């Protein structure tokens, strides 16, 4: 296993062997707990994965094919493995590796190859915020992942919206993230406005999981006194009426969050 992994790492250096090596290493993230430090400390390996990513920046008119996207998605999954490991995550952030993903979170291209990239890139960020570590939250606050998530939340696929909402939610759930978002009215109202637009869209194309994450964001915003006061005036009607009765029929948790939200607002 370790033997194969070191071979595949070497085989990233030859174009003829590179793709197979990427795919095989990616397959080992399920079963090799020490894969991330092996990747991180093997000379050139992180750079090879970043080169995979950088190599398709010129593909963003959008010319990315599904073959190119699947290759890079495997590199990203390897980076996610590094992001998720406690021995490599801090160094991962210190090297600013998430920034290499932001072009894939930024592009508005609707092609399926960019959707695979977008989802996998969101997966890396989501793996970071899943830790709820202050270091992660604060890193993301200074690198402006928030407007990237907001743009996806408004216009992405239902699944991209869900992951991007999950990322913003984890930031809101942190006290520093909530205080940062509520520090200026413009930050808060950008978040509130985008959430309001998703609520309207959800009334037309319902998704129980996306609604759940949107509601959680609202509920957390209502912990902040200034956000509470704005939501007292601007909370979307759809969160208090029968709009989502059918979607909520079995979601005891969201209904309970919605009731808690309204109560907070008095």
């Amino acid at each position: 296993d370790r033997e194969k992994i070191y071979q595949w790492i070497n085989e990233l250096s030859s174009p003829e062997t590179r793709e197979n090596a990427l795919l095989e290493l990616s397959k080992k993230r399920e079963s090799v707990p020490d894969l991330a430090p092996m990747l991180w400390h093997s000379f050139g390996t992180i750079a090879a994965l970043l080169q995979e990513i950088v190599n398709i920046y010129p593909s963003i008119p959008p010319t990315l094919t599904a073959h190119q996207s699947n290759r890079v998605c495997n590199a990203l999954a390897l980076l996610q493995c590094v992001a998720s490991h406690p021995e490599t995550r801090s160094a991962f952030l210190a090297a600013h590796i998430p920034l290499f993903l932001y072009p894939f979170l930024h592009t508005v291209s609707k092609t399926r190859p960019f959707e695979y990239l977008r989802l996998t890139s969101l997966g890396v960020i989501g793996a970071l915020v899943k830790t709820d570590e202050q270091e992660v939250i604060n890193f993301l606050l200074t690198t402006e992942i928030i407007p990237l998530c907001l743009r996806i939340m408004e216009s992405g696929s239902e699944l991209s919206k869900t992951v991007a909402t999950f990322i913003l939610q984890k930031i809101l759930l942190d006290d520093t993230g909530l205080a940062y978002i509520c520090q200026t009215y413009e930050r808060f109202s950008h978040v509130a406005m985008i959430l309001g637009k998703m609520v309207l869209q959800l009334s037309k194309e319902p998704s129980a999981r996306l609604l759940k994450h949107v509601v959680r964001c609202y509920l957390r915003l209502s912990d902040n006194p200034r956000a509470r006061e704005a939501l007292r005036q601007c909370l979307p009607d759809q969160l208090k009426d029968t709009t989502f009765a059918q979607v909520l029929k079995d979601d005891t948790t969201t209904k309970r969050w919605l009731a808690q939200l309204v109560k907070n607002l008095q």
């Binding site: 990616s26 094919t65 599904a66 073959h67 996207s69 699947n70 998605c73 495997n74 990203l76 999954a77 996610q80 998720s84 092609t111 399926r112 190859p113 959707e115 695979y116 989802l119 996998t120 969101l122 997966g123 890396v124 989501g126 793996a127 899943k130 699944l159 869900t162 992951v163 999950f166 999981r209 994450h213």
Partner: peptide
């Protein structure tokens, strides 16, 4: 555009597998 070849199926499966790690 609804065409999918193997790389589409592989990349989408990979993406979903990555996201299933987040318990969404």
């Amino acid at each position: 555009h609804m065409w999918e070849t193997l790389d589409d199926q592989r990349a989408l499966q990979l993406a979903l597998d990555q996201l299933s790690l987040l318990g969404l």
